[PDB]
Write an enzyme that holds these catalytic residues in place. Structure first.
Site, PDB file in Angstrom:
ATOM      1  N   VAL A  58     -11.081  37.344  -0.755  1.00 36.39           N
ATOM      2  CA  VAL A  58     -12.513  37.321  -1.005  1.00 36.39           C
ATOM      3  C   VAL A  58     -13.132  35.984  -0.537  1.00 36.39           C
ATOM      4  CG1 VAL A  58     -14.345  37.492  -2.774  1.00 36.39           C
ATOM      5  CG2 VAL A  58     -12.310  38.892  -2.920  1.00 36.39           C
ATOM      6  N   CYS A  59     -12.459  34.875  -0.856  1.00 39.09           N
ATOM      7  CA  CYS A  59     -13.034  33.533  -0.719  1.00 39.09           C
ATOM      8  C   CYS A  59     -13.663  33.239   0.658  1.00 39.09           C
ATOM      9  CB  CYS A  59     -12.002  32.476  -1.127  1.00 39.09           C
ATOM     10  SG  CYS A  59     -11.207  32.824  -2.719  1.00 39.09           S
TER      11      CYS A  59
END
Lengths: 194, 194, 194, 194, 194, 194, 194, 194, 194, 194
Positions: G48-49
């Protein structure tokens, strides 16, 4: 200390000089069933003290005849007691004694009766009246330079005996034979008229 | 509490019923320079208590004439005191009084003299002798059913006055006019010859 | 208690019986500049104790001649001390004394030297050697039934004096006139050839 | 620390150099049933210390013959002890030893006997006499520069043995063969008139 | 203890045996401006210890020539140290020393470097590298049975000196003359091509 | 932290990057029965660190062949580790690894080995040798700019193994094949002569 | 932690990777006078990051054009950040960045914003809106597996700006150009009719 | 308060106004097995609040249809709630509601979700997403003047449902139908190509 | 003190003056199953107090007829109470009483009802309405110079009885026969039309 | 809480709905120089409460005309108050008010007057009379289902005013024009005869 009216008198069990010149442990519980006048004094070989101790010794029977023992106590050793006993009264000694004298060398007994004078390490002139159930009923403490009155100790013991025996209450200055009263609003009227 | 011999008597400043029937604050420091006999009793409208209070009131002058005041104290209000004063002695009242009576409604005074009976909320029969420097010199506490002796209070005050005046020491049972002695090993020999 | 070697000896200022029969406060600081042998004993009018006290009193001069005082101490009052002094030696008394005897009535001195026997209220046979700067240099404590040796006290004082004067060290069993040694690895070799 | 007379001696179980040159744990309980003279010294390879340690080693038999062991102790390791043992006396060594020497490397033993000099990490010259029940009966502590006396240790052990065997009490300076007395007011008169 | 990297090394000021055979206080602050290798060993007169101590003594100059001193330390007294110095190497002695040896008799130094073995009272084989500002830069501690490597200590000192001088960083296994690198993402690429 | 020599190494169980590129928990107890070299480094993608990590990875076999595992650890995530592994050595990467690398993301492991540099959140260059019973035997911590020596780690592991196997002790600078000695005063003489 | 709405945002001053590839301290006080969107992410090199970080980086100008900066933060070092920046987006890297990324290696910043996941050592997906006086005005925290929405962060910043500028209040779902209302009982009626 | 992500949501059981106009206790455990959006607002009869409350009420079905309930909460009594419900939307009322509204009169619920504004006694605009196991998964808190977005709450619930159903992870800005990725270094490569 | 509405009234068991002139313990639990009006007054023999006490005594039956007892209490002894009872009303007395009066000599009862005026030792004019389950339902406390109203106490008792019997609620100024209402939003509408 | 008779009333300064429909802070100190009747009620939009509030509002002038203000207070917001004011009395509303109503949203005011019902978050029916010097003189607290009486509040205020003006004391049931008495044993006789 630790002595409160109508609570058990602080317990003790300590070496004492007995009337016959021997050393023996004397325990408070040995007086169960009797009245006891326990009294303290500051120092062996002094001034007021032998006058008090000798008066109580000479008059023990006035106490024993009404079921009351007497016991003396100070900071000094048994050996000081014994030595003091060996000097004649006319030289400031005790002579023969008819009461035991406790040797409170640790000072725990005087501490618990609340009569230690901490700065000097000696007992004030405390006198305590303990009843047959071993509860404390009367406290008297004099500063060192004024002696106690043996007749007043006797009056008090008699008054307390009277109260136990009859359920009446003893007025100011009561002596054997004076009027007493029942502690009841209606029955007390008899005392107050005439 | 914190009443200890040879320490300042616990200070107080409390409403009292005065002899003239008024209410006024009485403070321990008012008695500075005099001897004081402070005495407690349990409850207004009771039995031993009026015999004691009335004796001390009737005989105030025996105390005043030698520089000694007397003060009474109990748990009751000033209004109870006043009311009790309004009832004649022959009905168990006090009648007119010549001594003030403190109303220790918060009980702080009796707590500090160590004479509160916590379970009941009343004072034991404590009597205290305070000297002109306001130090406590003699403690006496009786259980409730046995009254105190006014002649003995007087004897004690006198004995303490005598000691302060002459630097001598008062033997057992001392009454004015009896032999006393200097508290010194050498000089005391004179006494022990008689 | 708090008596530690090479710390200031615990300070005291207490009533004592002096050799001339009087009572006076004796303060540790009054021995500043002198060596002091302070020794405790359990009880007046007992058994080992007078043999020790009398030996130190008879031989004070052996100590005073070399700049060392001696001071005795027990739990008993000054009055017990004085009385004991009034009995002859052949009856178990002390007779005349050349040494003061402290009366540690509060027991604070013995507590601080660590020689109180708590269960009995009396001092063990503690002996302490205090130097002119008032630091503690030697501690000796015997159980009650075994007496101390005065010759050994004297030997120790002499040894400590010798060490202060010459910066040498005193071997086992040293007596005046025996070999001593410098506390230095090289200079000590002289002593050890022998 | 916690060494008190008439209490159990503080227990220990620590590595020691034994007479035969080996290392072994020595426990206080090993001496149960015997008298023990336990003595501390500051440092191996110094000055007073070997004169004391050698004297006790040479004279062990004077102690063994009367049921008393001797034990030495210092802050140094076993290996220092052993090394010191390997140097001849004339060079400041110990030579062969007849007594064990504890190696109190953690310093817990000297702490518990109260003879640690905290600033330096070494023991003062403490000597302790422990009886067969393992209670402490005598304490002796010298500052570092003054050695102890072996004859006096022996005198004390003998005196204590004498007291346990006969129930009599040993006067000042007592040596085997001297008069002793029963610790009783009446029976002690025999000692004092003679 | 409280030895932490990049904090001031725990300060000390203690008696040491100096190379010339004398005793003198050595203080950490004496080494301000120099690198210091401080190293601990368990016990005088043992086994691994002399092999380490003698190696550092023989090779001091390798350290002095680059501005680094060396200092040894153990629990033993100065007198043990001196004695050990007096025995030849072939009998397990140290012989003449070119480095001082601290005598950490109170054990406060080893405690503060965190190398006390509490159960035994001795130091582990701790070695510490302290820089000229007196901050700790390297910690090494071996269990007792394995000796340290002097060549590795020297490598480390050199590496640390190199880093101060040039602002570069020393790779694994670095020896004088090996490639180093700048601690920068871009400039380090030069090192990693090789 | 709580890493102490001869006590159980602080336990851990944490995610690691394994040689085969996977993530798995590695627990200290997995190494029971083996020697372990646990080593910490400050940060992935830096400078000294890959030279050390790669040296230990390249030479694992020198350690495995003698029953010793090696484990690396830093503050970085397992994903940083994996990424760093994916870069070639010539660009400052790790390439393929033969040792696991712990990801001490909570920093609890470095805290417990005492090698956290608190101000920065990274580990110092701490290296620990743990034995088959899981006790810690050797501690090494370098400041960040100086790398460790793999040959010295190997020497230490070997020396410790040698000591377990033969009950002898390893001198300064010991390498396989050098003389060792028994830690006994008598038997050690054979090492010290010739 | 200590992040509370309408209180000063917890202060920080920490190393960051700057857009130009350098390392610099970034302090919260640098953003005084501007709006700031501070956002945290768990770990470099994850999933996600980067989708979040790259979205905020691509769209900075949408924020900078309305007086709002953006700042990212994670547990990883600057060197991990830099490395991640060096990998192309199509391989899960960041590529070039237009926002700084803090390296919260001590984890003190995430602790203080209350978004540390203690068990893992990483930050949750916390996003905070801080105003020009540096007070916190909006808190958003997502569990790790669900990404945030950049358009919603933008909507919030715009709404908060609108509220400062006009003293009106922004309804549910407000977008620029929608109706708002005055927070007054009377004046709000205009919003609620039609 | 004590609301933490991935911990059980703080439990509550409190009076609420139900959609049918009645008062009933609503307990968090009633929602076990469902998703819950719990949202707080400051005060009945105000401004932003009815726009939010009415939006969530109108759109409940969008939440129910996917297994998610919604629940509102404020400091006001149930009677205030009911009254507000009785006023039409066009005069700032709520009208009929399809969502229950808790009356957190003791403020214990808002305290435990950490959204009390202590100075005013009201809740901030906190919104929480709780999953079927009753763990907290998303926190949102706005200052009072800016309303929340219902579409975003819906997006988040959907994203969380998606993650639980498929074990994949939801990128920035994810809407139903967008690409997602497996949280695995290898399998994620397919996402990052596009 | 600890009197709180809808909690058990603080329990008591204390001596009281009963209507028939006797002394008896009265315990709160004696009134289980009845309503109780407990009321305190400052001092016997005062001013407001007898007007209140006499009014409650004269009108007891108005309370008994509806299942409610009344009890008075003050700081004074039972003997003060009895005495006050013996004086006729026209002289400020109470005369015959139909209610008991507690004698709270320890002040524990007033302390627990929170109506002690600490500085004076007397109770404020506290009046408490206790229900048949012994829970406290109404508190009234007046400063000393203003008397209470008996008709108000009666109104309250009636109102509380009415509420328990019918489940309705009593409006402002309610008297028997006035309209009441059901505490329900819908059913209350009937009351508010009028 | 801390409201005590004859101590300063607990201070407050809080938002209130004023008679003219505005919001303003009302501070206790604003009422200095006036009498104040402060009264609490549980909840807006309920049952007993509007009957009490309306009745005090209708009759304010009966209080103002004699120098007494009245102030109401509850847990609800200003906005609830305002709304309730906007509903007609016949629908259970307040209509126009002549008295301010505090909004004690933090509940700090009811806590300090000791009338919080902790379990529900609402105030009991507490009413307090505060004098011009701002000391508390009368406390009244009803359980929720029974309303207070406005005529009795008025009677009390008048009685207290009367007492301050004339130094007399107000008997049971006193209404303006009834006999009062001087609180003096002598002067009170006039009241008690005829």
């Amino acid at each position: 200390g630790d002595a409160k009216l109508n609570h058990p008198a602080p317990d003790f069990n300590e070496t004492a000089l007995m009337p016959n010149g021997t050393f023996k442990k004397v325990a408070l519980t040995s007086y169960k069933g009797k009245w006891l006048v326990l009294f303290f004094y500051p120092m062996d070989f002094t001034f007021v003290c032998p006058t008090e101790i000798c008066q109580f010794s000479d008059r023990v029977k006035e106490f024993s005849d009404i079921g009351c023992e007497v016991l003396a106590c100070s900071m000094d050793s048994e050996y000081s007691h014994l030595a003091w006993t060996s000097i004649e009264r006319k030289r400031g000694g005790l002579g023969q004694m008819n009461i035991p004298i406790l040797a409170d060398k640790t000072k725990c007994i005087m501490k618990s009766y609340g009569v230690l004078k901490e700065e000097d390490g000696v007992a004030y002139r405390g006198l305590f009246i303990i009843d047959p159930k071993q509860n404390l009923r009367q406290i008297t403490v004099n500063d060192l330079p004024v002696g106690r009155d043996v007749d007043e100790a006797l009056r008090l013991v008699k008054a307390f005996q009277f109260v136990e025996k009859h359920g009446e209450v003893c007025p100011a200055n009561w002596k054997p034979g004076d009027k007493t009263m029942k502690p009841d609003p209606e029955k007390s009227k008899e005392y107050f008229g005439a």
